[PDB]
Amino acid sequence: AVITDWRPEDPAFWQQRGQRIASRNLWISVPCLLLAFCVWMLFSAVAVNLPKVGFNFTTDQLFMLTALPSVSGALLRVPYSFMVPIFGGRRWTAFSTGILIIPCVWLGFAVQDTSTPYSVFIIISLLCGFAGANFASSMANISFFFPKQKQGGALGLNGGLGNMGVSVMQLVAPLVVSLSIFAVFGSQGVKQPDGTELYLANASWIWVPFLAIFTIAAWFGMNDLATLPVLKRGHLWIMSLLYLATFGSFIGFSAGFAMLSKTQFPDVQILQYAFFGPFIGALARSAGGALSDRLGGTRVTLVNFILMAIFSGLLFLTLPTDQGGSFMAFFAVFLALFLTAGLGSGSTFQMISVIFRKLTMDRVKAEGGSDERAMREAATDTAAALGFISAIGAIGGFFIPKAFGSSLALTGSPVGAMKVFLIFYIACVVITWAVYGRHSKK
Numbered sequence: 050a051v052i053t054d055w056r057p058e059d060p061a062f063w064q065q066r067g068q069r070i071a072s073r074n075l076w077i078s079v080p081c082l083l084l085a086f087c088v089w090m091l092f093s094a095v096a097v098n099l100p101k102v103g104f105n106f107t108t109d110q111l112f113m114l115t116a117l118p119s120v121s122g123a124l125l126r127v128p129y130s131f132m133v134p135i136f137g138g139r140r141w142t143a144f145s146t147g148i149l150i151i152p153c154v155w156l157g158f159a160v161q162d163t164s165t166p167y168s169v170f171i172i173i174s175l176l177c178g179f180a181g182a183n184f185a186s187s188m189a190n191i192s193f194f195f196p197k198q199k200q201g202g203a204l205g206l207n208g209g210l211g212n213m214g215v216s217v218m219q220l221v222a223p224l225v226v227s228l229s230i231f232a233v234f235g236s237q238g239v240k241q242p243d244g245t246e247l248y249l250a251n252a253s254w255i256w257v258p259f260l261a262i263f264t265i266a267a268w269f270g271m272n273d274l275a276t277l278p279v280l281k282r283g284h285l286w287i288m289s290l291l292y293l294a295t296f297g298s299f300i301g302f303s304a305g306f307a308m309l310s311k312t313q314f315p316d317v318q319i320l321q322y323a324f325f326g327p328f329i330g331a332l333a334r335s336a337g338g339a340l341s342d343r344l345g346g347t348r349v350t351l352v353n354f355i356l357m358a359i360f361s362g363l364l365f366l367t368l369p370t371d372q373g374g375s376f377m378a379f380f381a382v383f384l385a386l387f388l389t390a391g392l393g394s395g396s397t398f399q400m401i402s403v404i405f406r407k408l409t410m411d412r413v414k415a416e417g418g419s420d421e422r423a424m425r426e427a428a429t430d431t432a433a434a435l436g437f438i439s440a441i442g443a444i445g446g447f448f449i450p451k452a453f454g455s456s457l458a459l460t461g462s463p464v465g466a467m468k469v470f471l472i473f474y475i476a477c478v479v480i481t482w483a484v485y486g487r488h489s490k491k
């Protein structure tokens with residue numbers, strides 16, 4: 050039922066009923082969020098296979114389809130974070146998971162109809178973006194179920210396994226598309242040059258039964274708990290760039306890596322390999338957080354950004370001047386980018402929760418605030434900041450595939466976009482060096 054008496058900080062309460070309830074909510078939240086990341090990056094897999102079905106959209110148009118869900122995603126993250134305390138975690142989780150069936154079902158029918166206008170795919174693309182907003186509400190919700198000591202571990206597991214949703218989708222979708230399942234629901238195949246049949250509808254339809262099962266499980270298994278001037282702070286905008294360069298890079302490369310590989314090395318079936326990128330990136334986010342706890346987020350973030358810049362530079366030497374070579378180098382460097390982008394995602398996030406909380410602490414104390422008020426306002430501000438940072442960092446998921454699409458459109462080469470990425474990474478190691486010299490000497 051709806052919980053009125055929730056005392057997670059009380060050890061006796063936690064041992065008695067708190068831990069068991071919070072364990073159940075967390076472990077229904079994780080699959081629900083994982084599925085959100087599946088639906089969010091759907092077009093990273095589908096847009097690769099649209100020409101194979103009969104669509105004649107330009108390369109720039111295809112990239113745009115992978116880019117757009119990060120727009121609505123970013124925009125809706127701040128509103129989504131406000132929804133949980135209003136409607137409760139259980140109800141909003143079920144609602145925000147369930148509505149993802151609409152673009153999943155729609156896209157399945159849409160890909161079988163080569164008369165479907167590009168405009169309709171734009172709508173579906175944006176609709177998939179709703180899935181990208183679930184992160185803000187899912188994470189906000191889980192924080193209330195855990196004591197401040199265990200939130201770090203609880204939020205890390207929910208977000209970590211959540212981000213795994215990209216890789217599992219980029220693994221499963223290419224596999225079920227070759228399968229003749231869902232025929233009873235009208236799954237029609239398209240004959241490919243190699244003789245095999247392509248069932249593109251399966252790529253989105255495969256999630257519908259799982260979206261439904263955990264929509265049901267959310268309504269029956271989760272609970273509701275009865276229990277900003279941050280924009281002005283210059284540090285908020287400073288940190289947002291860093292999370293933009295890391296999480297934005299992870300989610301941006303996830304959106305457009307397959308599409309790019311198709312434009313650089315068209316022979317390689319990238320879809321049987323691409324998932325590994327977002328896979329290690331999602332694992333490195335957890336690694337990045339763990340390292341940051343032991344050594345300090347800033348130190349981890351700084352070294353990571355130097356690494357992002359190096360591999361950003363090395364990526365130029367892998368590209369073909371269309372002929373020729375080398376894919377194996379190209380993929381290796383991109384794995385390194387995924388890993389560092391993920392690593393930096395976790396490190397930056399830990400860093401923001403530390404730096405912003407510390408400066409908030411020192412501020413209210415400087416105003417003559419009590420220790421009690423200092424701690425709680427530091428909690429409000431950091432929770433408010435991270436939510437806003439997370440929304441801004443999401444826009445990188447648009448920028449990178451949009452930059453690849455534009456660079457190729459006017460030059461025929463992605464190096465223009467990559468050069469922009471390199472400068473951004475070099476700017477970031479400068480930024481991160483600055484905060485290491487003023488705000489973080491620990």
Ligand code: NI
Nearest residue numbers: 284484487488
């Ligand atoms: Ni400063």
